[PDB]
């Protein structure tokens, strides 16, 4: 079972990944560590002024950080315990297999 968690802010995402890794060992299933995936960076470049000043620009970027967690064994006791966790609202999760 593979859990992929993404977020805009890396600190809360890392905290969620560490929480998942730590809690997954309550009923140990040979936990596979939280691995980081390549951050995806979207860039936007705007003219600074409202009118006619093309040579002045401002750069903005939006980054998506991605982490992956795997459990080798199912561990149903530890699986149903993962339903109600402490998930920061900025962290978006996805479970799959």
């Amino acid at each position: 079972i593979r859990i992929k968690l993404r977020g805009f802010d890396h600190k809360t995402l890392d905290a969620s990944a560490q929480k998942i890794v730590e809690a997954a060992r309550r009923s140990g299933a040979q936990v596979s560590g939280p691995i980081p995936l390549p951050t995806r960076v979207r860039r936007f470049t705007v003219i600074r002024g409202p009118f006619k000043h093309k040579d002045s620009r401002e750069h903005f970027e939006l980054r998506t950080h991605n982490r992956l967690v795997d459990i080798i064994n199912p561990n149903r006791k530890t699986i149903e315990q993962l339903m109600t966790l402490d998930l920061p609202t900025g962290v978006e999760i996805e479970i799959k297999t």
Partner: protein, 127 residues
């Protein structure tokens, strides 16, 4: 048995393994004179193997990726020098004075808004 070196240069990364052998060198599964075919500076990578007399005493297995052929050549040189200095500490001399064991941190400069390039400015004209 092995001796390892890592060499980075201008987006190019080289992994070098040294073994005792007749002197056969192989880059990315092919031959040296075939991978760098028709490139005059391709001998420069084996400069560290010439300052230390083990030019034909080491079989070298090299995997390069990234950058370009010249950057890969310099990455290979740095990796070979690092592997040689890992062969014994006494190889640091005759390599440090020639700078074979220093990273060259010259990267391409980023383009900036308002310029055609990193520093090339648009053509100017008063009036």
């Amino acid at each position: 048995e092995q001796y390892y070196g890592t060499g980075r240069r201008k987006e190019a990364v080289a992994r070098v393994f040294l073994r005792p052998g007749n002197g056969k060198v192989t880059v990315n599964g092919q031959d040296f004179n075939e991978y760098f075919q028709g490139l005059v500076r391709a001998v420069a990578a084996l400069e560290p193997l010439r300052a230390v007399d083990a030019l034909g005493h080491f079989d070298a297995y090299i995997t390069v990726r990234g950058g370009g052929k010249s950057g890969q050549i310099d990455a290979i040189k740095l990796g070979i020098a690092r592997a040689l200095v890992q062969y014994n500490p006494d190889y640091r001399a005759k390599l440090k004075p020639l700078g074979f064991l220093t990273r060259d941190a010259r990267v391409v400069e980023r383009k900036k808004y308002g310029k055609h390039k990193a520093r090339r400015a648009p053509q100017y004209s008063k009036r």
